[PDB]
Structure formats: C-alpha cells, structure tokens
C-alpha cells in the first residue's frame, strides 16, 4: 500500500541514528569489565544478561526508517556468529564506527562510491597485514590451550578437545551430549554429516542452541520433491507406532506437506522434521544412497517405480540421535552393520581408480571421509545436573572456538589484533582524496573494539590505545589485570577467523549504507 | 554505442528539424534536450559534471562516448559499452507515449480520500 | 542587559545562513550580464540598481545571530573598495566560497585552526603566483588605454588623465571638479593632501561619493587638543559672517566641542568640519606649520601663550575648495603668496643637507613633494548639464581604476585572474591533511567569481570554468561577447591592486569565522 | 533597520501581482466607453472620476512587495504625461501586457536578459514604423482641427490655438490665463521661459495644475549658492512690505535657507519661491543677466564684491506674472523698457557676428529668440465663473496635444496606431529563440490598448482587434460610434509623440522587472 519514500541526508542520518541504538545498546556487555542490559520479559521476571546476542535479537524501534537501519547492521553481524563462533557484537560496534564516520564524510562533500572502495582497500589489506600475527594452531598440545581459554581456564576442557580431534583429526565431526553421570566419557561412532539446515523454524525444539534434536528417530529417505501430504501418511501414521519421531531427507518440501508437518509437530502430534538431501545433480542421487547404507534403509525414487505409499517401516532408516542447525545437518550412530558399510567403501574405493578427472576425484574422496572417520561424541562429567548442564555448554562455546583456531590460527585478542594490524597500514593510499580518506576512516574504525573495552573500564581509551599503539608485536592491555604485556601469554586471544570475519561483514553493510540514497518502507498507518 | 551515448549522438544530429509552428518546434527542443538524460544520469551517479561529460560526447561524433566505469573517453563498441538497438528504441518511444498523453490532459477523476 | 549566548555549530550555521544572504543578494549584480535588485525607498519610487555596493549598505537581517555574521563579511569587504576601488562584491563572493566549504569541513571533524593555516597558505602564494600575470603599466601611452577602458571606450578620458599624471607624477594629487561648459580644462594650483579623514560622518554634504565639500572655507590652525567649546566662540562667530564655512585642524577634538559641532553644522548653522593634524610626535608641530604658510594663516600653539580666544579671520587659513574622505584630507588652492612658500621649500631644501640619519631624510623629502608638486585639477567637458554630470563620474571611476594600475599593474579581468593563478598551485601543500583541505577549499573558492558571471548569462558554469582552466595565459572567457581568447587584448582587466586586495580580505573573515566558537549579543526584547 | 530580502519567483510574483492592481484599477477608465472608479476621501463625500492618473496616484498597497511593483510601474508611466500630455494609463496598461506575459515566459525557463533585448529592439522599430503613419502638421489649418478635437469638438478653440502660433511660431510660448468678462483675449508681451522647476513641492498653490502661480511678484537674481537664511533677512523684510511675494533666482539654495522658505511661506508669511538659475558654466553668469535687464532688476554677484544685505527693492526683477512647474519656469510680462531690452538683443545680435564655432552660436541664436518673441497669452472667454474655469481647462489640454502634434505629427488614435504598427513586424526576429519570444511578448502587448476599450464596451476585443488587423491604414474601430472606417477622418487620434512615449517607456520598466532577481525592503512591523 502507500509507501513513504525518503532520499538524501534524511535517508541516511535516520538510518545511522537508527544504528547507534543497536550499537550503543551492546557495546556496553563488552568484554569482561562489561555491565548488564535488562532485557524486560511479559510473563515473570525480566531478563538480565551481558550476552550481546540477545541484547540484539530484542532490538526493533519505532520509526520505521531508523529501525530498517537498525535492522540491516543487525542482520549481517549475525552472520559472523554462523561462521566463526563469536564476533558479532564486535562486528557491530565496528560498523557502527565505519558508518559514523563515513556518512559524516559523504555529507561533508565527499564521493560515497570511492569512499566505499578506500575502505574495502583498507580492508582487504588489514585481512592480510592480520594473517600475519596469526599464530599456527596444529600440535594437540596448543590446542588443548585454546580450548582452556575458551572454557575460562579449564584445563579438563582443554583435553577433552585435544583427545577428540586425535581420534578424527582436526578436520573431522564432534559433538557432545549429556553425561551419564561423572568422569568424561569419549567413543567414535559410525555417523555423518552434511551442509544442510532446518527448512523452517519452528522444529527448533531447544532455542538456546537454536537447533532441534530427536533421539532414536526414523529417517525418510526418497528421491524427489514433496508437495501432497497424501504420499506421507501410509508412513506418517506407521511412525505414530512406536511413538518416535520421523526425519525427512528428500530432494525438498514445498509450501503444501510442509506448512502441514510445521503444524502437526507442533501440537505434539508426532515430532518430524525435513531437510534438503545433500548436493545436487548426479551426485545427489548417489549420496543419498550412503545414507541409506548408513542407516539400514532404502532409497525411494521413482526412476524404479516406487512410492511413498508403499513403505513399511523397514524401508526406513535409523540412528540413535541427529541435529540440525539452521545450515547443518548431522546423523549420530547409525544402524548401518559394519558389513554394508565397509564394502560401500571399498565400491567407492575404486571409484577413485577408475578416475579420470580431478573433480571426479575430489568429490569422491570427500564422499568417504565422511563415511570412515565416523563421529566424536563426548559425554560431559558430571556431579548434579545443574553443575553437568553448564559443562556442557562451556565445551560447546569451547569445541566451537578451537575448531576456527586449527583452520586460520589465533590472535592477540582483546581488541589489540586490530589496533596492531592498522596500525602498520598507516602508508596505505589509494586514488583520489575521496579514498585516502576511505581509508583513514576504515582504519581509525578499527581502535573502537579496543577503545569500547578501556571505556567498560572508566580507563580512558584515548591512552590505553595510544600507549597499544606506541609499541609492536602481540603487546596489548589486559582488560583483565588492567596491566599491559604479551597478549597470547596472558591468555587473551581469539581464533583468527573470527577477528576476521568481523571486520569484514562489518565492513560490508557499512559500504552500502555509504553508498545509499533512496529508502522506502510502508506509511507509519 | 550504450551507455547514454546512443541518444545523445542521435538528438545531436536532429538539431536542424523544425515543424509548422514555434509550439511544435518547442516539442521538438523538448524532445532532443530530453536524450541527454540517460548519459547526464550516470555522469552524475559518479560525482562528475555531466554538465561536461555530455557537452564532450555531444563535441564529436560516431560512437565515441565516455565509459562510465572507467572514466575515460574512447569508442563504446570497442570498449564493449552498448545495448541492443531495439532497446534504447523502445524505451524512446514509449517513454514519449505517457508523456504525451500527460501533456494533453485537462481532467482527472479519482475517488474521495475517505 | 542579559545577553544570549551561543557555542559550536550553533554559532555558525547562524553565521552562514546570515552571510548567505549578504551574499546571495549581491552576487547577481554581478558582471555585464548582471540582474537588477529592487531597494525600497521610503517616501517616493523604489530604486532599482545593479551597484552591488548600494546593494550591501541596505542589508541587517532580523536574527540578531544571522546579521551578526552578515555583518561582518560585509565590513570587511568594504575594504576592499576603500583601498583599490572597487571588488567589494567580489570580497563577498568569495568569502562567501571560503566559509560555506569551511564550516562544511570544521563540522565534519577537522581542527579549525589548520583549515586557517591551509588557506592563508595558499593565498599568501596565489597573491604572488599573481604578481606574475600582473603586466606593468608605467608608460603614457599604457595608462591610456585603461582608462580609456574604465570609462568605457571614451578615448578622450584615457587622455584627460595621462595629461594629468604627466604633470605631477603617477604619485601625484589629482581631483575633478565641474566644467564651465565644453572643452576639457587642466592646470596646476598649490595644493596639499595628507593621510587623515573626517573626525565623524554627519559632517557629509554628499553621501554620493561619502565626503565632505567646502568652499572657500576658513582653515583653523592650532595645535593642541580641543574638548571646551568655550574656546572656538570667539571665531566660530567671526566666522558667521563673511557667511564661509571653517575647516578644522588640531591635535584633536574630544567629545565635547565635537558633538557640538556635529550639531550645530547639522541645523545649517555655519557648517564646520575637523581633522586630526598631519602625523605626530615633533614632525607633527612642523608638518603642520607648512599648511599654515601654504594656506596664508598662523599656527596656534600654547607653547608661545597663544589662546583660541584671541585670533581673528586674519589668523585663519584659506582656499577655494577641499574635500575629505573616510581617511583622507585634501586642500586645494590656497591663498598662500608664491614667496612664502618658494622660500619654506628652500628652508626644507636644506633641511636635507644637514642631514644626519635616513629617516630624517625620507619625512623630509615627502614633506617637499606634497608641499611643491601642488594638485592637478580636471574640470570635465560639457554640452548640457545632465551630460556633464554623467562623464565627472566616469571620470573618476577611470582615474581611480588607473591609479590603482600603476601601482601594481593589471591582469586578465572578468573573474579568469583568479581561476588562472588558483590553477597552478595545484600541488602546493601543508603539514597534516587538515591544512591541504584548508588550501584545496581555498582553491575551489576562486572559481567562484568566474563561475557565478557565467551563471548570469544562464551558460553552465560548469564547463566555462573548466575550459578556462584547461588552457594558460591570460585565455579567459569574455562574458560579453560570449566568446574566448585573450582577456587582455579583449580589453577586459582590472587593476591587479584589487583583485589582491579582494581575495586576501576575503580570507581574512572567512577564518576568523571558521575559528569562532562562541557568540554574545543582547537578547531579543 | 532590519530588513526583509526575497530572490526568484518570489521576487517577482509580488512585483507582478502588486501591478496587476495599478493596471486592472486604472484600465477601465479607458477610452470613451469607460467606467467610474470611486475614490474615498476622508472629510466629505466620495469622489467619482474617470481620469485614470487621480485614479493612480490613489494607489499604494499594503504587502511592502506588491507595493513595491506597483509603484515603480507606476512612476514611469508618469513620465509620458510629463513629456506628451496624456498617455500614462496607456504606458501602464502596455507595461502591465508585457511584465504579465514575460515573468510568464521566465518562469518558464528562457533567459531574461534576452527576453529583454528582443523587447527592445521589438519596440526600437515598432518606434519607426510608427514614425511612417505620422501625418503632418504645419498649416495653420490642421493645426486647428486637432486643438478642435483635443477640445471636444469646440472649434472656438482650435482657432484660438492657430492664431497664437500664428504669432510667435509653432516653436514660441504660451500661457492660459483667467478671463476678464467674456470674449477670448490675446496679446504679445515681453516674457521669457526656462528649462527649470520649483526647488521642492509645497510652494505650489494651485494643487489642480500641480504647478505655483505669483501675481506682480518681486523677483531675486543672486549668482552664488544660497545656505545662511541670514543673507535674506535684509531683503526678505523689505518684501514683507508692500506686501508682494518673492522669486527666487540664484546658483542654487541648500538645506539650510531652504527648508527655512519651504516653512516661512507655509504659514502665509509672506509667500516665496525659488529655482536653480538658468543653465552653467559661463553662459550662465550671462542668461542670468539678461533676465535682469528683461525685469528692471540687478544681478547680485560675489566677483565685484555685492552682498545680499545690501539690496533694496529696488535692484529687484519685477513681472506681472509667473508659473513654475515641476521643471519648467516662465516668467510673463516684465518691468523692463523696450530701451535697455532692444539694447541688449543688438549686443547679442552682434555676439553671433563675431562667431567662431557651431556651438557659441546655437546657445547664441537660442538666447535671443526666448528674448525678442517674448510670450503669448490667451485670456479665455466667459459668461459665469463656472463655465470660464471649464473651458480654460479644455484650452490648456488642447493647446498642450496640439503642440505635440507639431513635433512629431499624429496618428490613428483609439488604440489602432499600435495594432497597425505590430502588425507589419510580424517577420522580425532576433539571435536566439530566447529573443524571437522577447519579440512576440512586445507585439502581442500592443494589441492590449485597443483589445481594452473594445472591452469597456461589451464587445468581444477577440474579433474587434482581429478585423482591423486583417486590413491596413488608418482604418480602424470607433469605440464611440461601434462602427469601423478611417480613424483619422472620423477624427480619432493621438499626437505621435504620445503613442511613441507611452510605448517605450512601458518598455523600459517592464523590461528591469523581467530582469530582476532581488528586492529588498523593510520589515512588516
């Protein structure tokens, strides 16, 4: 309907100042010496936290313009999280000074478009200039150290990583559930895991992870796409039986069976959920099958003649346990006998004889990786349940962290890592003024994390850097002991990836915001 | 030759052609001073006086036109600058229907904003 | 009474938005193809006029902040004119350029102080990058032809004052009386002109050209300063009758007998006018005994028991006309015999053989030049009141424009001079980027006069400009005719003096403005 | 004082809307078929007239902006009047077509600067075309029919008018004095009349003429400048006496003895009126003489030592009677003996023997002629106080158009002369298109006139104009008679001086308004 529609200045300055709330709003639960944001609840008592992440989910303003700003910054940051394990608040704090200072410069006469490219010079030179200080992460003996750190300095933690990543290597699967009861246990078990997330909300059955979980479940394995529901239920009600839940792997599910099961899983008639089978093409035909082989249970195409009417629950696969994020799926111990399994190993051994291309090839040795190294599962200590639930999670956040230092190393943290790598760039020059200054902006935007800590402090930033700045190396201030040193020593650091990762998104949206001159949203009626 | 170019070439030429009253000659000034849109835009979608860009272009011929992304002049075919002739026709034409229609309206009728 | 008082942005928004129009209203008026601007009168016709000039002195604005701001570019430009002879609407102009890309920097985060810096750097060059194009004009037959060009084409003034400066020297006095009907008159009367103006307008009997006018005036010389009236009664009575006005020249005049005559002059009785004397200190004493012999009086000084009591019309100077500016005197023909004076120039003659020092020297070679090479008159043609009284004026604005020639030369007019020198120094730089901004603004802001004459022809500025610059020389654009190529040739040139003064007048405000944080004025009751 | 400034449309919008008052309330008046405009008065009853300048000088309105418009326009018009004798609610009726049809054409985006030129040039041969119907009129017979005109048909009067000329050539001088009992008088006296006007209003005492009037005054000659009253007292006491008012003849009278007669004669003590001598320069020390030996009287000069003090009655110039209009003096009958008079032609006779230039002769030839054909005076008729006052009215009127007609000739009246004019034009053409239109504006615009009373009339101006377009000549439309033929011998017309003035001067206004881009007045309070 009639639309309100903005341009200029007006267009902008509502959508920065509609930032520097979801920005100030968070910058505050930063670091350690970070202060508590109230997060009012309806029913019961309000919700107090340092979490950034739900300081910002519970963000959404009035003015439907300042809000849409709000909202975009909002949107990419989180992205940082689905990567690396972390960042977000940072990535938005950065934008925030990006785009503070960059629409203060485009109002000021200067070229948006060159602007936006000073700043991804700026940027995608630092990325590099920090690639640098990244400090290699291969021997399980610092990797017991990450994992440490990322527990708050304990050392059990720290192990159980290390050991797990022994068994699989550090590119292989581990998760971890519920203890049984003390002392850490740790075994491999023959499972999986694919690039493909949840097809809606809603399964979510735990929505502090943010994932669903189903234990024991039937797996629905066919090949083709699911519109009419009608199909299901000869199998939908021979799965009521046994009372387990149902997960769906086909080509897809579109808005009919869909928008039903959504609804039926959701009064408790019967829990399910579905994802897209895994790839694409040819290859997804053939994947498919090893999940089949995997789960003691059979394909369902219609290239032979089947129909999802007539299968039994025999046809069906099965495990002890599955999770699937919002782009993750993961089977846990399979039924699969290890005689079906073993020898579909050995037919795609071959497979990569017979080869005649070197994409043929890849994709075949990633096929059986998947396939051999099973899955690590480690089952948390214990000594009553509130103390085994909070284990639990600080081995996730742990697990998480590592996993992103094994692949792009570590760096000082604490804010330094960026004051360090801007702080050598300070020669960096592009074309025209209009991208010098695209630059001194990206870079003077890089002192905020930092900066924002001192300030959580009562410690005045503008020293604190100045003095971070006037040296080298990994030497930065502990926020901590609120004295300075060697960074990695001290123990502050975070993966690489994810100082990364912040400092791009945060640069993304911040480019376009630069380079904005039209807004149009609904009329506030 | 895309890019804006195409029109500003064609309505360079037409400087001469006239009609049968100064009211039509006008349609027409209208018409030509109107193609130089287009090119003006982009000149402008970069902070540079399309004032200029265009008078330049305009200063020659052919399909010598001034590349938008790299920001010096030279032959838009060669430089791999252009869009299918039966576009940029198109869109000069039924650009010129509405207008028209527009310019020889006397009378609307809408409901009551209630 | 309680003032109102503000800081910061504030401040100076009202300050801009308060020249914007000082200027806004002037810089149409501008060039040949300049527009006409209405003054409202009170009793009678509205004036319309295209005098810039006349166009300021009628601009005060209603919020006392935004005149405030107003109010002092426009006191500044008035420089201009006061020592050149006209550029006043281009002092504005420019200003106007320097301080709307000033502010627009200052409030966009860089230091004031620097943007001060960075401009009066690169004016201080552009002045001499100036003094290049600048093409002499000692010769004769030069000094014709500019003002022949200042009185628009009329080769008979060009003329009338080379004849002039070749009888006393490009360093002489020269004045324009009325003509006793057709055919141009020239001759040489025994004059004088010292640096000191009236003591208070009012005394102004021709706010046309803004001085005063008497004659065959009465001179009053005493030396000593004057606050009882009581004094003057004894001979401002004697001199009612002979019904002459009086010229007064003292050590000075003080609030009381000042604001006496300031009002006594003012009903029309006896119109009076004062001046400080000549100098100070003990050449003051002496300078001003020279006007006593020059003007057939006496010297009244309390050092020989002389009282103003007791002086007759005897004692008193007398010419047959003088005139007085803002700050400038000027006697012309005095009843002084040619032996008195010859003689006091032989007394001086030998003054400077006696000579010990340099200084003593130069105050007493000037002390004989203004005092032997008298003052040229030029009573202007005629045929018919009307005419005469329109070519007097052209006349002094050619002679004027001229003088202001010989002393530092011409260059190409019509707004290129600038755009040419600004052109060059497009590498010079400073310290810090604050201060290459502060010169680059300074640059950008003299395209501005050129830019603005092209827009009173409705031809895009845009380009005019840019073609002006991308060649050299005097290559200008010739707003009249439409049409390129050689300014100078074209005849199109202002004396290079002003296009100085009004470009460093201009500076001078924009940077105090652009280094102001605070403003207090009265309260708006 | 804090003054309000508006640019752009604005502007303007206001000039025109503060015109289309002047116009639309004075535009009816028009021609024969025109209306009643009321004008309230304060005491008395309301006054109903028909004479479009009464109608005009009533006009002033409230926003200071239309104000302004309206009285400028307003102020040009008034100078057709001042040079023709009729015209003004034609100069403002055309002026009010063009401004209405340029502002039009700049808003809409042509330049205005040209707009104006091709105005300009449009008029410049208009100007001539118009010179071609110009009939004649030199014989003594023509004469009569058109003062027989200008005089409602009256053909006493025309005759009057050609027996005047008849004695003092077509080229001499004529007054309309009061009659003395029925049957027109006339006779040749010794007289005289000069180009210059009364110093300041208020010395008028016949409101209706807008001029003053003295009966056997005394009359003052004094070369110099006239400030200190004091000078007077001597001479304005013994003119206290026999009780006749005085004229004053001097170089000039400033401020001072101004203001002080402007009052003196004000209050009825003794009645006085003063005027700048006639011409400058040398030959004004002359005429001023001869003015004497014309008036018995004495010149009163500082070159042989006279001073106003010492003057009787006796060296006083002395006359029967004197006018003084805005710029026109005349003095009629004097003193002088036809011995010293006939003396002082023959002195002069010789002056142009010994002639040795075009222009000491010319000034020569002049000085005679106004001194040897002194001045005619009508004496109008009677039969009751009421009807001599009417007719003496039409007499001046008539004689007034009459004399030019002489000049310039006459023309198609009643609007044709225009339409006639614009309509063999309709090829010419300027530079740009921008011009052509500045051209079409200015014909269009001289259709209004006629387009006009063809409106007062009730009859579609549409055709009316149309058809006497669509011939040529002088045939025209008779408003009073609703039927066409030749508007000369259906004795319709206007001298060619006025339909000349009225056009051009419509002109000029029209022409700075379209030009105009800022207007700066007071504020509302």
């Given at each position: 309907?009639?639309?309100?529609?903005?341009?200029?200045?007006?267009?902008?300055?509502?959508?920065?100042?509609?930032?520097?709330?979801?920005?100030?709003?968070?910058?505050?639960?930063?670091?350690?010496?970070?202060?508590?944001?109230?997060?009012?609840?309806?029913?019961?008592?309000?919700?107090?936290?340092?979490?950034?992440?739900?300081?910002?989910?519970?963000?959404?303003?009035?003015?439907?313009?300042?809000?849409?700003?709000?909202?975009?910054?909002?949107?990419?940051?989180?992205?940082?999280?689905?990567?690396?394990?972390?960042?977000?608040?940072?990535?938005?704090?950065?934008?925030?000074?990006?785009?503070?200072?960059?629409?203060?410069?485009?109002?000021?006469?200067?070229?948006?478009?060159?602007?936006?490219?000073?700043?991804?010079?700026?940027?995608?030179?630092?990325?590099?200039?920090?690639?640098?200080?990244?400090?290699?992460?291969?021997?399980?003996?610092?990797?017991?150290?990450?994992?440490?750190?990322?527990?708050?300095?304990?050392?059990?933690?720290?192990?159980?990583?290390?050991?797990?990543?022994?068994?699989?290597?550090?590119?292989?699967?581990?998760?971890?559930?519920?203890?049984?009861?003390?002392?850490?246990?740790?075994?491999?078990?023959?499972?999986?895991?694919?690039?493909?997330?949840?097809?809606?909300?809603?399964?979510?059955?735990?929505?502090?992870?943010?994932?669903?979980?189903?234990?024991?479940?039937?797996?629905?394995?066919?090949?083709?796409?699911?519109?009419?529901?009608?199909?299901?239920?000869?199998?939908?009600?021979?799965?009521?039986?046994?009372?387990?839940?149902?997960?769906?792997?086909?080509?897809?599910?579109?808005?009919?069976?869909?928008?039903?099961?959504?609804?039926?899983?959701?009064?408790?008639?019967?829990?399910?959920?579905?994802?897209?089978?895994?790839?694409?093409?040819?290859?997804?035909?053939?994947?498919?099958?090893?999940?089949?082989?995997?789960?003691?249970?059979?394909?369902?195409?219609?290239?032979?003649?089947?129909?999802?009417?007539?299968?039994?629950?025999?046809?069906?696969?099965?495990?002890?346990?599955?999770?699937?994020?919002?782009?993750?799926?993961?089977?846990?111990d399979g039924v699969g006998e290890e005689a079906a399994i073993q020898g579909r190993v050995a037919q795609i051994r071959q497979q990569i004889e017979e080869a005649t291309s070197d994409y043929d090839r890849e994709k075949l040795q990633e096929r059986v990786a998947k396939l051999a190294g099973g899955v690590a599962v480690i089952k948390v200590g214990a000594a009553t349940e509130v103390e085994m639930k909070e284990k639990k999670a600080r081995v996730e956040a742990a697990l998480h962290a590592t996993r992103a230092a094994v692949e792009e190393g570590v760096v000082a943290g604490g804010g330094v890592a960026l004051i360090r790598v801007a702080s050598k760039l300070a020669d960096l020059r592009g074309q025209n003024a209009d991208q010098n200054v695209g630059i001194k902006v990206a870079l003077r935007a890089m002192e905020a994390p930092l900066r924002q800590?001192?300030?959580?402090?009562?410690?005045?930033?503008?020293?604190?850097?100045?003095?971070?700045?006037?040296?080298?190396?990994?030497?930065?201030?502990?926020?901590?002991?609120?004295?300075?040193?060697?960074?990695?020593?001290?123990?502050?650091?975070?993966?690489?990836?994810?100082?990364?990762?912040?400092?791009?998104?945060?640069?993304?949206?911040?480019?376009?915001?630069?380079?904005?001159?039209?807004?149009?949203?609904?009329?506030?009626?």
């Amino acid at each position: 309907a009639a639309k309100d529609v903005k341009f200029g200045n007006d267009a902008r300055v509502k959508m920065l100042r509609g930032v520097n709330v979801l920005a100030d709003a968070v910058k505050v639960t930063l670091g350690p010496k970070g202060r508590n944001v109230v997060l009012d609840k309806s029913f019961g008592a309000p919700t107090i936290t340092k979490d950034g992440v739900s300081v910002a989910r519970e963000i959404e303003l009035e003015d439907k313009f300042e809000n849409m700003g709000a909202q975009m910054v909002k949107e990419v940051a989180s992205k940082a999280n689905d990567a690396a394990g972390d960042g977000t608040t940072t990535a938005t704090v950065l934008a925030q000074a990006i785009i503070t200072e960059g629409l203060k410069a485009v109002a000021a006469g200067m070229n948006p478009m060159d602007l936006k490219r000073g700043i991804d010079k700026a940027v995608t030179a630092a990325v590099e200039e920090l690639k640098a200080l990244s400090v290699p992460c291969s021997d399980s003996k610092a990797i017991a150290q990450v994992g440490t750190i990322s527990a708050n300095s304990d050392e059990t933690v720290g192990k159980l990583i290390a050991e797990a990543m022994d068994k699989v290597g550090k590119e292989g699967v581990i998760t971890v559930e519920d203890g049984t009861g003390l002392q850490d246990e740790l075994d491999v078990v023959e499972g999986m895991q694919f690039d493909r997330g949840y097809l809606s909300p809603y399964f979510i059955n735990k929505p502090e992870t943010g994932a669903v979980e189903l234990e024991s479940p039937f797996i629905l394995l066919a090949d083709k796409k699911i519109s009419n529901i009608r199909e299901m239920l000869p199998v939908l009600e021979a799965v009521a039986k046994a009372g387990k839940p149902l997960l769906i792997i086909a080509e897809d599910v579109e808005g009919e069976a869909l928008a039903t099961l959504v609804v039926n899983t959701m009064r408790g008639i019967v829990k399910v959920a579905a994802v897209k089978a895994p790839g694409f093409g040819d290859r997804r035909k053939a994947m498919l099958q090893d999940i089949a082989t995997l789960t003691g249970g059979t394909v369902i195409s219609e290239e032979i003649g089947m129909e999802l009417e007539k299968a039994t629950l025999e046809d069906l696969g099965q495990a002890k346990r599955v999770v699937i994020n919002k782009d993750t799926t993961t089977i846990i111990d399979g039924v699969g006998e290890e005689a079906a399994i073993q020898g579909r190993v050995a037919q795609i051994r071959q497979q990569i004889e017979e080869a005649t291309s070197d994409y043929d090839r890849e994709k075949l040795q990633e096929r059986v990786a998947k396939l051999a190294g099973g899955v690590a599962v480690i089952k948390v200590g214990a000594a009553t349940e509130v103390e085994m639930k909070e284990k639990k999670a600080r081995v996730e956040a742990a697990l998480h962290a590592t996993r992103a230092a094994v692949e792009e190393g570590v760096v000082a943290g604490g804010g330094v890592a960026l004051i360090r790598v801007a702080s050598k760039l300070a020669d960096l020059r592009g074309q025209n003024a209009d991208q010098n200054v695209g630059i001194k902006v990206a870079l003077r935007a890089m002192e905020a994390p930092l900066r924002q800590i001192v300030l959580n402090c009562g410690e005045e930033p503008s020293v604190v850097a100045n003095t971070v700045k006037g040296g080298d190396g990994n030497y930065g201030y502990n926020a901590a002991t609120e004295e300075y040193g060697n960074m990695i020593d001290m123990g502050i650091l975070d993966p690489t990836k994810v100082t990364r990762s912040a400092l791009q998104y945060a640069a993304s949206v911040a480019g376009l915001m630069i380079t904005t001159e039209c807004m149009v949203t609904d009329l506030p009626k």
